[PDB]
C-alpha cells in the first residue's frame, strides 16, 4: 500500500510536468522572440554555451 | 545583346499584366477595377505606350470609342480561335498536303526500326505492318486537320515574331493574314487580337498567346496520339494504346469546355478545375461499393455546383464596374448555363466509356483548356483570413501532440542508435517510464496510453546531432530569384508604377546596401558577396541573427524572402531531411482509407502547434530556434504581392512597408506557415498526429504523405454482428475514423473540409496514379501534350530538343505500353523539327539546315543511297552518339539502363543498317556482297588518335570516348566561359576556385596517370573524394543558364558570344557524322574490317581504348543484351539460355496481374562490415566522405603508394590521419569492385521497359545459363549484367504480344559467348602523384568538407 | 495518519490535473486594433468559451469554436461527417439533367 | 515520513497558488537557466578533457 | 524504499514549481517584467564567462 500510493502520486505528478512543460514551450513564441525572452524560457543549449566558452578563451 | 523569347509557356499568364495593358489602352477598367487599372493609365509603362501608339491599334481604339467594336475577355477569343474553321483551296489544301507528308515520312522513318525489331525477334515501306498502317492514315480526319492547321498558323505567327525580335529589338508583329479574320498585334509585352467580322477586341499578354499556341499544340497532340493509336488498334488490338477514344466526342469536349470558359470569363477555370473530381467519381463508380461512391458522387456534384455558383458570383462582382460590364451572357443571369455544364460533363462520361483506361487517361483534359489569368492580390486576400485567425487549443491537445512526437523520436533513436536520446530531464519520468530509459526500450502503440503521451511531453533532450559548420554551397545556390531586403522591396515594381517619393527614396536606399543585397537573384546574390565566408550561415543559426531582423519581408509572386533568411529556411529543412526523417519513414478486420489534401494545411499551423514538436528538434541539434524560425519571425514582417504590375498603393511620404497601410495584396500579422517553408516539419507533426489518432481511436493507421496528399490507411479488428456485411463494416469504420480525424485535427487549429477530404475502401488515386487490383492505369497522354519543336532547350539547342522529344515520347511505351505508337509519334515530331522547323531557327536561320543537308549528302554517298530523302530516314535512325538523329537507342525499348552506352550505340547502328544491308540479326555476322556495315565498323575502329586530358575527362564522365569521337555537350563547351566569368566574381570563394580551375584540372589529371590499368569508375570515386567535384558542380550549374556572360551584367539579353558558341556547338554536332564516317576509303583502309568471328563488345573495348590510346580500360565495357541474346520460342536439344515463361492463363497479359513478385532489377549489394561508433556525431557531409575514402581503400589497396595515398587523402579531406580514420572506414568483404562498386556513374538498378505490375506475369529461370557460364568461367565474375538479361526477357515478352496479339508461352534467350568475357579485379601498378594529389586539395580548399575535429573524434569512440 | 495525510495530497493532485486538463490556450495573433501581436492567452475552458462569445478574442466561425471547445458536435461538423451527404438545390438540378 | 508528506502537501498547495495566478494573468526563473546551462556546460567540458 | 520515492517526488515537485515561475513571470508585465528578463540574461551570459575562464 504505502510505497504503492506514492507510485500514483509519481505517475500523476509526472503528467502535471508534461502539461506545464508543453505550456512553457507553447507560451514562448512569436512575442517572446520579439521581446528577447524566449531563451530565458527554453534555456540555453549546446551551440550557444560553446560560443560562450570560446568567448571565455 | 539579343533577346530570345519563350516558345512555350514557362511561367504564368498574369491577370495584373493583362489588366494594366488593356486598361491603359481602352481608358477604363478592363478586367478588374483595382489599383492595377489606375496607375496603369496615370503613368503607363513605355512598353504599353509603344503598343498603343501603333497605327494599327490607334484605329482599333478609335473604332472602339465610336462603339463599332465590342471589347471582350481573352477566353472569348480563346473560344473563337479554337473553333476557327476557315478554309479555302489554298489553306485546307496546303495543310492537308503537309500533314499527309508528315505522316508518310514518320511511318517511313519508323519502318526501319520496326524492320530491325521484327528481324531480331524473328516475327519505302518494307514491313507489311506499316504498309497496312499507311493505307489507313492516308487521309487525316477533319478534326485533326483542324488543330494541325490552327497550330501551324499560331506557331508560325510565334516563329515570325521570335526570329524578327532576335534580328532587331522592339519588334511588334502586326499580322492580319496568317489567320483569316483575326488580326494580331503580337509582342512580348502584349497581344491585341481584333476580329472584324464579329467586331471584337481583346487585349492580353504574350504568355496568353503562348498558352493559346500550347492549347492548339496539345489538342493536336491528343488527336495525333488518338488517331495513330486507333489505326494501330484497327490493325492489332494490342498494338496501340490501352485507351480507345472517339475523336468527334473529344473535339466536342474541347468545344464545350471552350463554351464554358466563354460564358464564365477567367472564372470559368474554377469549373474546369472540378473536372478532376467528376472523373474521379466515374472511376469510383466502377471500383467502389455503393456507400463510398454514392457519398463521393454527391460531394462531387456539390463541389462542381458550388464552383459554378462561386464563379457566377465572382464574375458578376468583378465585371460590374469594368469595361466588360455588358459582356456577361444572359445564360449566366437566367441560370441556363446549368444545361451547358450538364452537356459538358455528360460528354466526359461519354469519352470515358465506363472504361478505366479511357477514364484514367482522360486526365489530360485538366490541362487542355489553357491556364487561368491568376489574380495575385485576390489569392493573397483569400489567405490573409486563414492566417490571422485565432486558434483555441486544449492544453491537453498540445501536450499529446508534443508527446506523440517525442515518442517517435525515442522510438527512432532506439531503433537506429540502439539507445534512448540523452535526456536532460530523466527525473520527470515515472518508474514505469524511467525503467524504459535504462533498458533502452520503448512500449508499443498498443501498450501506450494517452497519459504516457502527456508525461513524455515533459522530456527535454541533450544535443544528439550537430550543425554543419561550413555552408554547403550546392544547397544554397540555384537559378531562381531572390526577394530584395525590405527597404528595397519597392525595386520589384516598375519605376512608373511607384510615386515620386518612393523612386527618389530607393535611389538613396541603394547607396547603403551591398551589391549582394541589391542582387535580385540567388546566384548573383552569392557571386557578388565580397565578404562571404563559409561560417556565416552557422554563426547566424547560433547567434539567432534572423530574429527581429529589420530586413525581413515575404514577397509573393510562390513566396520568397531575402537571402539571409532563405539560408536559414533551407538549412532548417535540410537538417530535418538528414537527421530527423529517419524516424518518420512514412514521408473481421475492417479496413478503410481516408485521403486528405494538405495544401492549405500549412495555413492552419501556428507557433503553439508547430514549435512544440519543432522545439524538440532544436534540442537535438543543440540550437535555439532554428527549426522554429518561421512562426517566430514571419508574424513581424509584411506579406506583400511583389508581382511587377500589381504594386500597392503607397500613401504620401510612406517609404517603409511596415508603415504602409494594409490593402489588397499587402497585409501584416501573418501567423501560420508560408507554404513550402517548413514543409518537412509539418509532415512529421502530421504523422505524429496520425499516431495520436491511432491511439485515441484504437485502429492501426498506416500513412503515406507525398506532397499535398496524405493517404491514410486504417484497420481495426472487429467481429461483425448478424446482418452486417464487410462493406457495411468498412463504411462504418471509415465514417467513425473520419469523425475522429476531424475532431483531432480541429483540436489543433485545423478545420478539415468535406471537399478536400474523402474516404475510400481501397487506396484510390494514391499518387495521381490509378492503380486498381494491382493493375496500373496510366495518364501517359497527359505527359506528352507539349511535345513539339524546341522543347526543353536553352537557346533552341537542336540536340537537347531531340533528346526531350525522344525522352517524353517513350512515356507512351514505358507507361502507355505501346512501342509502335511511341515510335510513330516520336518520328512525327522529330521529322518536324529536322525537316520542317530546322530552317526556321531563331538564332541560326538556316545554317543548321544547310549543315543537315550536307550531312545527308555525305550519308547518301557513304552508304550509296538513292535519295537525300532515304538519307534522312537513315540519319534519324542511327544513334546520337555518332552524331546521328536517333535520341532513343533501340535497347531502351527493352530495358531502361545499361552500363556501356557505346556498345548499345554500335549494336543500334548494326541493327539499323541491316535494313539497307539486309543482314539477319538472328544469324551470326557474316560476309555479304555489300560492305556497308563493314565500312561503318571500319570507320568506327579506324581513326586518328588524339587523346587529350584523358584522366580528368574519364573522371567526370567515366563513359567519355575521347579523340573527338563523340558529340560534345553544353557543360564542356561553356565551362571555360563559366570559369572566366567566375574569375571576376567579387566573392573570393568562387573567384579563386575559377582562377585555379584550369591548373587544378591539369594536376587532377596527373594524380591517377601512372596506374597502368584504368578503372574509370574508380577514377570517378577518386574525383568525388576531392574538393574539385564540388567546385565544378557550381560550374556545371552556371553553364546550364542562358547568357553565361551576362550573369553579372543585370540583363536578360543573351550575349552574342554565347550565341556564337552555341551556334558552333550545334553545327559541329550536326556535322559530326561526316567526321566520324569519312568517305576517304575509310582512312586509306582499302581492306575493310572483317565481320567473321567479330565480337561487338571487343570492338567497343578497342574503340574506347584507342580513343584515349590507353592500353587498358577495365570496368566500363559490357555486352549488349539485345545483341548478346538470340531469341527462341521453343526448347530444342540445346537446353540452354534464360527461360522466360508466362504464368497467366490468358493469351493477352497487357493490363493484367500475375502471381509473380514484381521485378525491380536491384543491384546485388556492396557487402561490407560497418564498424561500431557514434554515427550521429558526424554530419552527413562527413559520413559519405568516409564511405568514399573507404571505397578507395577498397579499389586501390594494391597501388604501390597506398599508405601515402590514403594518408595524404585522409588528412587533406577528413583531417584525421589514416589510422584514426581507418577505424571508421567500412571494411569491404566483396573481392570484386568491378562488379560491386556503387558510385554516381553506375546504374543503381536495372528495370525493364515494362510497367512494374506487368512483370508479375512472367517467371524467369536463369538456371541453364549458370551451368554454361560456370563450367567455363567457374565462379569468377564475368562481364554481362545479370539483371539486364532478365529485364530484356521480361520486356521481350510484352513487345512480342504487341506485334503478334499473343503473348508467347515462353521465350528462351541463348547468349553469344563470344560477347561474354572475364571481369576479374586487376592489380593496380604504379604510384599516385602525391604532390599533385595535394595540389588539388590545396587549390580547391574552399570546397573541402568539414574536418572531423578533436572534440568530435574522442566522442566517436 | 499516513493514510489521511497521504489522501489530502491525492486530492490536490486531482484538482491540479483538473485545472490543467481544462485550460484552453488561444494562439498568439494580431491585436483588435491589429497593430501588433498579443501573447498566447491561457485561460480556463468556460472563461474561454465566453471570451469567444463576447467577441473579446476576435475569431471567425465563432459558433464552431464554442461547439468544439465544448465536448459537443455542431451542425456543420455533423453535416461534413454524416453517413449520407445531401445535395444542394442547384446540384439537384444538375443531377436531374445528368439523368 | 509524516514530515515528508507534510512538505509535499505544503508545496502542492503552493503550486495551486501559482497555477491560479497563471489562469488569471524572476530570480527563481533565472536560477533554473543558470543551473541547467551550467550542467550542460560542465557536460561540454567533459568532452574537452578527453581531447 | 519509501525514501527513494519521497525524494523523487520532491525533485519532480520542484520541476513543477520552476515551470510555474517561468510562465507567471513571462505573462506578468510587460516592458518592466520582460526588460528584466533580458538584462538578467545579459548577466547570465557575462557571469557564465566569468565562472569559466577561472576553472
Ligand atoms: C552491376 O554492374 C555490373 C554487373 C555485372 C554482373 O552482374 N556480372 N555477372 C556476373 O558476374 C555473373 C557471374 C556468373 C558466374 C559466377 C560465372 N556463375 C554468372 C552470371 C550470369 C549472368 C547471366 C545469367 F543469365 C546467368 C548467370 N553472371 C557485370 C558488369 C557490371 O557493370 C560493369 C561493366 C561495368
Numbering used by the authors:
A (entry chain C): 130 to 186
B (entry chain A): 11 to 133, 184 to 617, 629 to 658, 691 to 1460
C (entry chain B): 130 to 228
D (entry chain E): 131 to 155, 174 to 199
E (entry chain D): 130 to 184
How do the authors describe this structure?
Based on previous reports showing that the RSV CD, MTase, and CTD were disordered, a reductionist strategy was devised in which the L protein was truncated to remove these domains, with the rationale that their removal might aid particle density and orientations. Ltrunc-P was readily amenable to addition of the MRK-1 ligand and a co-complex structure was solved at a resolution of 2.39 Å. Density corresponding to MRK-1 was identified in a pocket located within the PRNTase domain and formed by the conserved motifs B, D, and E. Phe1385 (motif E) undergoes a rotamer change to accommodate the fluorophenyl group of MRK-1 and make an edge-face pi interaction. The side chain of His1338 (motif D) also rotates nearly 90˚ to accommodate MRK-1. There are several key interactions between the ligand and RSV L. The hydrazide of MRK-1 forms hydrogen bonds with the backbone carbonyl of Ile1381 and the side chain of His1338. The 4-cyclopropoxy-3-methoxybenzoyl group lies on Val1384, while also contacting Pro1002, Gly1218 (motif A), and Arg1345. At the other end, the fluorophenyl group of MRK-1 sits in a hydrophobic pocket created by Ile1241, Ile1368, and Thr1365. The site of partial resistance to MRK-1, Ile1381, contacts the central pyridinyl ring of MRK-1. The MRK-1 pocket is largely pre-formed except for the rotation of Phe1385, indicating that inhibitors of this class may target a low energy state of the polymerase without induced fit.
The polymerase is a multifunctional enzyme that is responsible for transcribing the viral negative sense RNA genome to generate polyadenylated mRNAs with a 5′ methylguanosine cap and replicating it to generate new viral genomes. The L protein contains three enzymatic domains: an RNA-dependent RNA polymerase (RdRp), a polyribonucleotidyltransferase (PRNTase), which is involved in cap addition, and a methyltransferase (MTase) that methylates the cap. Here we report a conserved allosteric inhibitory site identified on the L polymerase proteins of RSV and HMPV that can be targeted by a dual-specificity, non-nucleoside inhibitor, termed MRK-1. Functional analyses indicate that MRK-1 inhibits conformational changes necessary for the polymerase to engage in RNA synthesis initiation and to transition into an elongation mode.
